[PDB]
């Protein structure tokens with residue numbers, strides 16, 4: 001029998017998550033990989049777990065019942081991941097199958113069927129982590145909301161906040177393929193270099209650069225991709241062109257402080273702005289087939305560039321959640337939970 | 349026999365609300381002889397009705413921060429929408445008695461070289477001339493055109509209309525009911541609540557004596573929000589919004605006299621997948637202008653489209669009417685009656 005560790009949602013944070021208090025790591029549960037009773041289901045080994053900015057918002061008290069369900073106190077966290085089937089008594093599932101979907105933040109789970117899971121099409125033998133990033137929900141977010149809401153015209157100017165993340169860096173590349181001038185900002189020099197590498201025309205570190213002054217010089221802006229909200233949205237509103245489109249994807253500047261105010265929303269009227277918020281899952285059905293047919297080949301060839309920040313060990317996941325909220329992840333945050341016994345064979 | 353050609357002059361930039369007598373002054377030093385004034389191929393135009401609109405506060409600022417539109421010039425007459433009648437014309441296309449709609453300086457008389465900025469009024473139903481600066485004027489166009497452009501209504505949805513008793517909001521209420529929507533609407537007085545009910549609001553309340561969030565909780569969620577107010581009312585609508593709501597951003601009067609009104613819960617735009625569209629009526633008007641003038645007059649004449657107005661008599665009051673509109677003290681669409689029209693006048697005892 002081996003350890004089946006779990007990352008537990010333990011207490012509601014007031015500001016930023018507190019690793020070891022907000023989330024705890026539990027190693028008291030075990031599983032026998034050969035003996036675990038499957039009951040016609042299958043044994044699924046967690047390989048890669050995504051850590052995403054939205055996880056902070058699920059750390060709240062239980063309130064009525066809405067579409068947005070908070071994490072349950074005392075239960076494992078959960079989110080997108082990749083796993084492999086070790087042992088199956090279910091005819092739809094074969095040992096060695098790699099599956100994508102929501103995973104509890106544990107080493108192993110026993111699933112009765114494929115509800116919530118999809119077989120992964122990996123024709124290019126890409127690292128499994130790409131299916132929770134550029135070929136996962138963050139890539140879908142950029143791909144689908146851009147096509148749905150940007151209405152880009154060649155020669156217009158777009159401002160992308162958090163341009164070095166998995167969403168923003170995808171958006172930059174879609175915007176350049178449409179012939180737009182791209183302004184993008186991130187929180188470190190290494191992220192600025194990546195933004196230039198994926199083709200940002202103006203790439204800057206918002207911690208060492210006056211954002212409003214850059215937008216004044218390089219704008220006005222026809223499209224704002226909002227990942228930050230707050231003062232950065234205010235800056236975009238001040239620099240907006242008439243008939244600008246504001247794609248409201250995230251507002252991370254308020255995730256750990258109860259939201260961030262906007263004081264100049266009147267520009268939406270004065271400048272005839274269309275500001276559209278979206279949740280990627282709501283618009284994905286229209287685009288999922290096209291996304292999975294188009295994106296893997298471009299990741300394999302380098303047409304679509306990506307970066308990731310891999311953290312090794314389920315026990316780090318709580319710290320990784322804080323790292324993302326604090327902007328300390330260098331790129332898309334991946335918790336590598338376990339290896340797959342193929343490609344990475346352990347030997348001395 | 350020269351008569352006073354009075355003028356409302358923009359005199360100083362206000363800090364909060366306009367101050368009649370300081371922000372605006374009434375100047376009676378100019379005279380005009382209606383019979384002898386040189387027209388020089390132009391025509392003499394007599395001001396009949398002037399609109400006072402909420403946006404006028406926004407033009408009362410320094411000329412440097414010139415933003416979307418043009419600010420009023422210090423020392424010059426104010427201006428805005430109005431109706432006037434031609435008294436005397438040396439212009440072959442313009443005839444005495446012609447009634448014209450467009451931008452008017454806030455004066456009793458003007459000499460125009462041509463019809464620039466003006467359009468003949470089609471008044472087949474002999475409606476009061478003031479309807480062409482309200483329900484059949486820019487405020488009615490605002491409701492008519494933005495609703496058709498942005499509401500994408502579906503039968504049985506719920507709309508919340510702020511400032512529901514004004515010329516914009518009460519027009520919106522009627523469009524929404526015609527589309528089969530449930531309508532919630534709020535205004536600032538009991539008399540305005542009665543009017544909102546008269547034009548068919550299903551839920552009509554006075555937001556000053558009734559908590560908006562409580563009404564929206566009981567009567568929502570809301571699929572469409574028509575924003576005339578911004579600020580805490582926009583915040584309340586965001587919290588009560590349905591998934592895929594449409595927020596039509598028309599005005600935000602709660603911040604016109606206080607440097608804007610903040611919004612603290614704009615994150616609801618993401619969580620509830622809201623489409624929030626701001627607009628300026630003059631930008632979308634060309635697309636709808638012909639259909640508007642073809643459809644609306646007959647409905648005003650028949651009572652199908654209902655309207656109210658609050659008439660103030662006398663050009664010298666206009667600055668006070670501007671403050672009144674900002675303070676919510678106008679009972680309905682604010683109209684300054686400048687002069688009567690002599691179309692059917694015959695002097696006799």
Ligand SMILES: NC(=O)c1ccc[n+]([C@@H]2O[C@H](COP(=O)([O-])OP(=O)(O)OC[C@H]3O[C@@H](n4cnc5c(N)ncnc54)[C@H](OP(=O)(O)O)[C@@H]3O)[C@@H](O)[C@H]2O)c1
Pocket residue numbers: 052053054137138141162163164165166167168185186187188191227228248249250251252253254278279280281324325326327328329331332333618
């Ligand atoms: N369906 C949706 O609407 C949807 C879907 C996916 C993602 N999102 C949102 O997209 C945004 C980015 O997602 P992602 O997967 O690409 O995450 P990410 O870029 O890998 O991580 C979040 C990044 O946000 C930056 N950040 C943290 N605090 C900040 C602050 N106060 N001010 C400015 N930047 C801050 C940090 O990068 P810097 O170096 O730039 O500071 C951090 O690395 C998030 O806001 C997410 O909530 C929305």
Ligand SMILES: NC(=O)c1ccc[n+]([C@@H]2O[C@H](COP(=O)([O-])OP(=O)(O)OC[C@H]3O[C@@H](n4cnc5c(N)ncnc54)[C@H](OP(=O)(O)O)[C@@H]3O)[C@@H](O)[C@H]2O)c1
Pocket residue numbers: 269401402403486487490511512513514515516517534535536537540576577597598599600601602603627628629630673674675676677678680681682
């Ligand atoms: N192109 C455009 O975007 C466009 C065009 C025309 C008009 N508008 C806007 O539409 C709105 C209504 O225009 P209207 O012609 O129909 O004017 P209106 O209703 O005749 O007059 C303004 C009204 O706003 C209400 N009000 C004033 N201060 C308020 C405050 N702090 N909080 C809440 N309500 C307040 C008042 O009525 P109650 O408080 O009693 O309800 C006041 O009567 C304005 O915001 C205007 O700027 C926009």
Ligand code: NA
Pocket residue numbers: 186187188326327328
């Ligand atoms: Na950072």
